[PDB]
Every structure is written in structure tokens, then in C-alpha cells.
Design a protein around this ligand. Sequence first.
Ligand SMILES: *[C@@H]1O[C@H](CO)[C@@H](O[C@@H]2O[C@H](CO)[C@@H](O)[C@H](O)[C@H]2NC(C)=O)[C@H](O)[C@H]1NC(C)=O
Ligand SMILES: *[C@@H]1O[C@H](CO)[C@@H](O[C@@H]2O[C@H](CO)[C@@H](O)[C@H](O)[C@H]2NC(C)=O)[C@H](O)[C@H]1NC(C)=O
Ligand SMILES: *[C@@H]1O[C@H](CO)[C@@H](O[C@@H]2O[C@H](CO)[C@@H](O)[C@H](O)[C@H]2NC(C)=O)[C@H](O)[C@H]1NC(C)=O
Ligand SMILES: *[C@@H]1O[C@H](CO)[C@@H](O[C@@H]2O[C@H](CO)[C@@H](O)[C@H](O)[C@H]2NC(C)=O)[C@H](O)[C@H]1NC(C)=O
Ligand SMILES: *[C@@H]1O[C@H](CO)[C@@H](O[C@@H]2O[C@H](CO)[C@@H](O)[C@H](O)[C@H]2NC(C)=O)[C@H](O)[C@H]1NC(C)=O
Ligand SMILES: *[C@@H]1O[C@H](CO)[C@@H](O)[C@H](O)[C@H]1NC(C)=O
Ligand SMILES: *[C@@H]1O[C@H](CO)[C@@H](O)[C@H](O)[C@H]1NC(C)=O
Ligand SMILES: *[C@@H]1O[C@H](CO)[C@@H](O)[C@H](O)[C@H]1NC(C)=O
Lengths: 596, 201
Amino acid sequence: STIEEQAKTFLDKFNHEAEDLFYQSSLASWNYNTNITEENVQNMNNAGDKWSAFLKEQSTLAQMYPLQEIQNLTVKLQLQALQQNGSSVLSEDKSKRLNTILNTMSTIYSTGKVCNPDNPQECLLLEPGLNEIMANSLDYNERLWAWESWRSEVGKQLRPLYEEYVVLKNEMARANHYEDYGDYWRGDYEVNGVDGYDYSRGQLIEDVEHTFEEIKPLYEHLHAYVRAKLMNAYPSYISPIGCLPAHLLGDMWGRFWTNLYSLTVPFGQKPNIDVTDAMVDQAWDAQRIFKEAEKFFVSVGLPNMTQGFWENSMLTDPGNVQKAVCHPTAWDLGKGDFRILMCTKVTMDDFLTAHHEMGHIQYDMAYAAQPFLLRNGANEGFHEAVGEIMSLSAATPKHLKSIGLLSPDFQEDNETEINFLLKQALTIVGTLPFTYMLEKWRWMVFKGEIPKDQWMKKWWEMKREIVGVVEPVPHDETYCDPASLFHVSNDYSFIRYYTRTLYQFQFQEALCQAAKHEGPLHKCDISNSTEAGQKLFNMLRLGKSEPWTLALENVVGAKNMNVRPLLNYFEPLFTWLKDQNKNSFVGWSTDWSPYA
Amino acid sequence: PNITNLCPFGEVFNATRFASVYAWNRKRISNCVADYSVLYNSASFSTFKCYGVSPTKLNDLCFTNVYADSFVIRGDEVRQIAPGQTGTIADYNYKLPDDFTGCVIAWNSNNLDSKVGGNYNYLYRLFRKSNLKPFERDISTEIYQAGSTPCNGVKGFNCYFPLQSYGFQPTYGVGYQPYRVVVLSFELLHAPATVCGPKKS
Ligand SMILES: *[C@@H]1O[C@H](CO)[C@@H](O[C@@H]2O[C@H](CO)[C@@H](O)[C@H](O)[C@H]2NC(C)=O)[C@H](O)[C@H]1NC(C)=O
Ligand SMILES: *[C@@H]1O[C@H](CO)[C@@H](O[C@@H]2O[C@H](CO)[C@@H](O)[C@H](O)[C@H]2NC(C)=O)[C@H](O)[C@H]1NC(C)=O
Ligand SMILES: *[C@@H]1O[C@H](CO)[C@@H](O[C@@H]2O[C@H](CO)[C@@H](O)[C@H](O)[C@H]2NC(C)=O)[C@H](O)[C@H]1NC(C)=O
Ligand SMILES: *[C@@H]1O[C@H](CO)[C@@H](O[C@@H]2O[C@H](CO)[C@@H](O)[C@H](O)[C@H]2NC(C)=O)[C@H](O)[C@H]1NC(C)=O
Ligand SMILES: *[C@@H]1O[C@H](CO)[C@@H](O[C@@H]2O[C@H](CO)[C@@H](O)[C@H](O)[C@H]2NC(C)=O)[C@H](O)[C@H]1NC(C)=O
Ligand SMILES: *[C@@H]1O[C@H](CO)[C@@H](O)[C@H](O)[C@H]1NC(C)=O
Ligand SMILES: *[C@@H]1O[C@H](CO)[C@@H](O)[C@H](O)[C@H]1NC(C)=O
Ligand SMILES: *[C@@H]1O[C@H](CO)[C@@H](O)[C@H](O)[C@H]1NC(C)=O
């Protein structure tokens, strides 16, 4: 009999149950998160597993419809997601062992305790404390001690577990007709539908460093300037020819360089833009912040927030024994239910975070008309980029002065613009090499190119080659330093944060071009621009229905992923740095080591 | 004379509970006087659309009998109650002819039908072999057979239960909240006219 016509009925039957089951699970999770209590835990679980159980049974049915006879692209794409076996392809003995090893890795990561030798009776944790030791401090010995303690008391037992985890996951992936586990993670950047928009799993590997070699000239000057400032701060500890140590960056792993802004400020006399005093003086409560955030999206042209968001969402003040988690989140419970969760205060950071979450909510509301299995972004880099665009466009002095939050006689000049641009560069462009290196190392180790013994020596020798960071102390093979990270032991992909940054600036440049703005890109604003609101809305509402290659065609001119806008955004900073580190060396040599 | 023997619109618009959409309730109104002014001037109705005749002139012309069809549907599903429309309701639950004359009234009832734990007392048909003729009711619960393998009244690989239940809750957004719908259809059979509007004095 026919297979194409009788799969639509199955999908329609599946959607009706999936919608309400997912709504109940999300409602239980929200009730638990808003009201942390013993009674509201089991119920959440009593929904959760049940939902998962559903996704089991339907999957067993999805295999009964062959995928080589479906002609409709939408139906085939929707059915392909359900046909995935997941981890249910291995035997029960191996599956339970995989679950146990994942659980024990997750538990061990969140139980860090290191006591210093002089007083072995006081240990710290990754929570504020040990993290704070190298987050805000000016010392060399204690930072190195904390670094070594964390990497030798939490990372020395994850290695035997990760060794078996890698091979077990690789076998599981090979059982699903993937050559390794790398293709499983790269499979989401793959489309085999419309002609001319085709993408392949192996194309991304060649496309990553092709758009990375253009950033090295920009990264080298920043590296040289940071090294010069550190030399001016730390005497006789950093060689001018070589590069900088690892524990002096400002974080546990050096993911971000934001904490280093205090030491490497261009101009000290000129202050930054802070409106918190004006926020307090004008008596702005938490409702005013969200009203102002709503006004931005109303002015752009996007639809207005639904009534009920102001009622159900816990906007501010958990207050009394009614405890709650203060992690800002945007909840899409389904059935037209959108909520927010935040512990709002009076701060510019809270203003930007509210803008970010409002952008997330708008993007979630955009594709509400798609079927249940297509209510997601085209890939993982679009959602957070859309979130960050609003934060980018709401920090300009023009927008602050327009809403009556800054003095109208403000006289911004070279100094403040350069300071703000350097502050943003210390966070945005300073993390791309780290992400690229980490993803490259993970892909190589999954592919099996590097054997077991070549684990701790390839990692450092590519860190020095790509990032320009040396090891403060030699690490032998028995260490497992990369596993000492959140998105390395919890089984999370890390390539999203690299493509998200490029998508953010591509979208911002496209909107600024289709907003009639003249001048530098860093002062651009998309407020009051209706034409810029439609162009975005044409791609927000597509969801996962269309390939991401076509998604990058209703906003930007070309469907490729090239880093053009980043080199134009930090153009004044680049041209100032060219004339700044004139009497110094630009580059690093991977021969000098702090220990020898 | 004085206006008397008013039609019982109270027991229709103010009923304690409404029937499901797949089993919509039909009431026959005849041999009385109908006052549409109170219905039209009321501000409680979210949707009030009259197709065949103008609402302002209802009190003038008068017909022989009226049929009131009452049920409960979703929020965004209201627009399917119109001539020449397609959907899950207009094809499997309630079909209106293209030459329909009458009025459609729909109002939100989220404070009554919705329940915090979920109200599962409202059902609708999801699968059927063929579309419905205008003004046709089907209450059969036979197992639908999508495939070619026969089912002996038992669900399975390609056999589904035709009826599915609504999940109304107070936290549902607009467009998913329950909406109560009453459709008035006027018949003009050649019998002497009985249902006529009041004579203003
Ligand atoms: C795949 O199936 C979907 C669902 O039927 C088709 O989408 C419909 O396309 C027609 C074309 O005019 C529209 O009128 C409908 O509104 C669309 N949606 C639905 C729910 O019917 C889609 O065109 C099909 N793709 C093909 C045949 O290539
Ligand atoms: C998911 O698991 C099912 C169950 O084993 C796989 O289906 C088997 O596929 C092989 C190879 O084509 C056949 O020889 C078996 O007869 C199939 N078993 C059943 C029960 O159908 C399937 O290949 C796996 N992968 C998917 C669906 O992508
Ligand atoms: C979202 O904003 C729009 C635009 O302001 C609102 O539409 C109108 O808003 C004005 C001023 O707020 C009101 O006087 C009108 O009555 C609104 N028209 C309608 C049809 O509502 C819209 O109401 C806002 N939505 C919400 C939920 O606040
Ligand atoms: C475009 O931006 C300007 C700048 O704020 C807005 O002008 C303000 O409008 C309000 C009333 O709507 C006045 O109270 C302010 O004094 C105006 N500010 C200035 C600097 O003129 C204008 O409303 C925006 N346009 C739209 C359509 O939102
Ligand atoms: C259903 O009953 C209510 C009674 O609350 C009727 O409401 C009438 O109109 C207003 C609404 O508050 C009030 O004057 C009274 O409550 C009611 N009586 C009169 C004379 O107005 C409502 O009209 C009834 N629905 C019907 C008859 O369809
Ligand atoms: C939070 O949970 C406790 C215990 O389950 C309950 O007593 C309390 O009423 C709840 N509060 C709210 C606001 O639901
Ligand atoms: C800004 O830079 C230009 C370019 O050198 C210079 O002429 C001008 O004086 C500077 N202004 C301030 C306030 O530093
Ligand atoms: C109509 O109402 C008036 C005033 O109440 C009354 O006087 C008259 O008798 C009524 N007519 C009839 C036929 O009952």
C-alpha cells in the first residue's frame, strides 16, 4: 500500500499527544524552579520520565515507514528526526554502563574540593571562592597554586573514565552509520534537500579555518598589546619575544579576557558609561526596565508581548521563604504560554539582560505556527545570535540619550569610544581561538588521529601554536586537563559559540545597511527603523522548516559564512593598535617556557 | 399588544454546560417572539458576525423557525465557522453550506470551562474517511483504519481512535483558551411564519 499518505496521519496523531505531554512536563519544571520544595520534585520527575517514555514508543513506530519513498520534503524532514535511535541501539549492558559513567562524571565534576597544604582543613569549590581566587587578584604564586590544585585533584580521575567513554560513544556512533562521533555532532550542520543549497558534514571542517586565517592579523596585535601591558604590570615574568602564561589570563581556563580589562585600560582618566546612578535617581523599578525593553521591540516593528506574560512570569523579588533560582531564563511552555524568570535589580547589566531575554522570547514567538518538531532555530548559532543582537543595539550612547537616561550635552570623543571598543574586544574576539582549538582537538581525538599516548602533548603543543599560551608547569600524560571544563564532561558541543559570533555581526551589519545609517558600525542603531524589522522577521518565522543556508539569504546577501563584519567593527581599534605597538614585537615563539 | 411569550434565549446562552463540538447541541425555536436587540447590544460577545442579513434589521423581517447550534471550540479555531472554509472542524465536525444565512456568536469562557488540572470532558473528531455534508452529525466511535490491514475494533499499527480530547487550562494563552459558540440558522419553509420580532410601542 501507499506510505506517503498514511504517514501524515501518524504525524498528526503524534503531534496531539506530544503537545500536551510536553506542556505538562514544562509546567511541572517551571513549578519546581519557581518554588523549590520537597513536594514539587517528585511530580516533576513523575512527568519527565513519562514524557521520555512517550518519545521511546513513537520512535519504535517511526522505523516502520521507509524514508526512501517519501517525496514531500517537509514530511521527510519531520520524520527523519523521529527515526533516530539515539542511545537505544546498543545492548542493555553497555547502555546502562554508559548512563552510569555519564552520571558519575557529572557528579565528580560538581564536587571539587582542594585544601592548601599549610591548612589542609579548608577546601574550596568551583562556586565563588576558588573561582574568585584567580578572578580578582594580583599575585603569581596563589593563582598558580589554585590552577595546579584544580587541574591535579579533579582532572586526574576523569582520564580513566573519559578513555572508556570515548571508545564507547564512538562505537555507539558507528552503529548509527557515522564514521565517528564527530559526524554525529556535525550532522546538525548538514542539509541534503534543495539543489544549490546542499551542505555536507565534512565541509564545515574545511570551512572553519578558512574563515579563521583572516582573524589572525587582528588577534596578533591584541596579543602583543596585552603582553606589553602585562609586562608593565608583572615585571621580569613575561618574555617580550615569547607569549604569556596560562593562569594570568583572568579566568579558570582563559575562556574570556574580561577580567583583564582593569590592567589593560587604554585611558585611565576618562571614565566609562554608567547610568546606574541615573537609574536610582529617577526611581526606576523592575517593571520600568521591562516596559522600556518592550518599547524597543514595538518601535522596531515586532509584535507586542501577550497579556499573561505580565501575570504568570516571576519578574522580580523571590523574597521570603518562597525560594527560587536566580538564573535568568525564558520559558516557552507551549500552547501560547511564554514566561520569564529573573531576579531583577537596578543595574545596566540587568537592563541588557532583560533586552536579551526579550529578544529570546520574541524569537520563540516568531515560529509558533510551525509543527511541533520544527519549533527551533535553523541551527544552534542563530538563537543566541538573535538574543545578542538586541544587547548589541541597546548599549549605544544615542539610544541611552534618546530615552532620557544620559545628559543631552554629552561630548563623546576618541577616548571613550576606544575604551568601549577595547572592552568589547577583550570579550568577543579574545575567545574565538580557544573555541577553535578545543573543537579541533575534540574532533581529532574522536576521529582517532591521535592515539592514547598522544593526548596531553598534542593539546599543549597546539595551544601554543594557535592561542599562544604556555603551560606554567609541565603536565605528563596522566593529566586530563580538557575534561576539567563544563562542556567537556557533560557531553556538550562547543562549536556553537564560534559560529554564533560570526552570525551576530553578519546580522548586525545587514540590519545597519538596511537601516540607512552613515558612519562607523559600532555607533549604529536599529531603533525607530521599520524596514529593518521586516527583514529580520522574514527569517525568524521560518524556524527549522527551511535549510539554514536559505535562512542566511533573507537577511544577508550571501549564503556563506565569512567573517567580513568583525574586521569592520573593530576597524578604529585595529588602526589605533597598529600605531600603538610600533616599538614592540608582534607574534609569539613556541620555544620559551616559564619553567625553563 | 404588549410583548409577551418571549423565546427562551436564557436557557441557551446561559446554560450550565455545553455539548462537545462533535456532538453539537441543536435547539428548535418556534412559536414565540425573539428580541435580538439585547443580544446585539451586549458587549460580552467577542465575535458577532451575521452573513445572510444585516444585524441592525433583524427585528423587521421574520421567519418560520430558528435553529440554535451550541458547542465549545478553541480560540483560533473560531474563524473556521464560516461558509467556504476548510480545516479539521469545517471538514470533520461542523460544516456550513456556502449559501448559509444566519448569525454566529462566539465568546470567551476561560473562567468556566478551564480547570487547573486540565478539563478533558470536551472531545473532537480528528480522523474520518470522508468530509461532512452541511448540517450532518456523526457520533460513531468505530476505530479508524488508515492502512490496509483490518482491525477487529482494536487500535494498533495503523488504526487510531477517532476522538481526541481538549486540554483546557487557565494558563493557556489566547487562541488556545475555550470559546463558547452559538450559531443561529433561520429557516423559511412555506409554512406560516411564527418566530417574529417584537412590535415596538
Ligand atoms: C508537503 O505537504 C505540505 C502539507 O500539505 C504542503 O503544504 C501545503 O501546500 C499548499 C500548496 O498551495 C498550501 O495551500 C497549504 O497551505 C500548505 N499547508 C498545508 C497544511 O496543506 C507542501 O506544499 C507539500 N510539499 C510538496 C508537495 O512539495
Ligand atoms: C535503529 O535500530 C533499528 C533496530 O535494530 C535498526 O533496524 C534494523 O536495521 C537493520 C539494517 O537495515 C536490519 O537488518 C534489521 O532487520 C532492522 N531491525 C528492525 C527491527 O527493523 C535501524 O537500522 C537503526 N537505525 C536507524 C533506524 O537509523
Ligand atoms: C501592544 O501594543 C500595541 C500598540 O500600542 C497595542 O495596541 C493598541 O495600543 C494602544 C496604546 O497602548 C491602545 O490604546 C489600543 O487600544 C491598542 N489596540 C488594541 C487593538 O489592543 C496593544 O494593545 C498592546 N498589547 C498588549 C497586550 O498590551
Ligand atoms: C524615534 O526616536 C525619537 C527619539 O527618542 C523619539 O522621539 C521622542 O518622542 C517622544 C514621544 O513619542 C517625546 O516625548 C521625546 O521628546 C522624543 N525625543 C526626541 C529626542 O525627540 C520618537 O518617538 C521615535 N519614533 C518612534 C516612531 O518611536
Ligand atoms: C444571562 O444572565 C445574565 C444575568 O447576569 C444576563 O445579564 C443581563 O444583562 C445585564 C448583565 O449584567 C444585567 O442587567 C443583568 O445581569 C441581566 N438582565 C438584564 C435585564 O439586563 C444575560 O443577558 C443572560 N444571557 C442571555 C439572556 O442570553
Ligand atoms: C510552594 O510549595 C510549598 C510546599 O509544596 C507550598 O506550601 C506553598 O504554598 C507553595 N507556594 C506557592 C506560591 O505555590
Ligand atoms: C581625536 O583624534 C584626532 C585625530 O588625531 C585629534 O585630532 C583630536 O584632537 C582628538 N580629540 C581628542 C578629544 O582627543
Ligand atoms: C399592556 O400593559 C399595560 C401597562 O402595564 C396594561 O395597562 C395593558 O392592560 C396591557 N395589555 C394587555 C393586553 O395585557
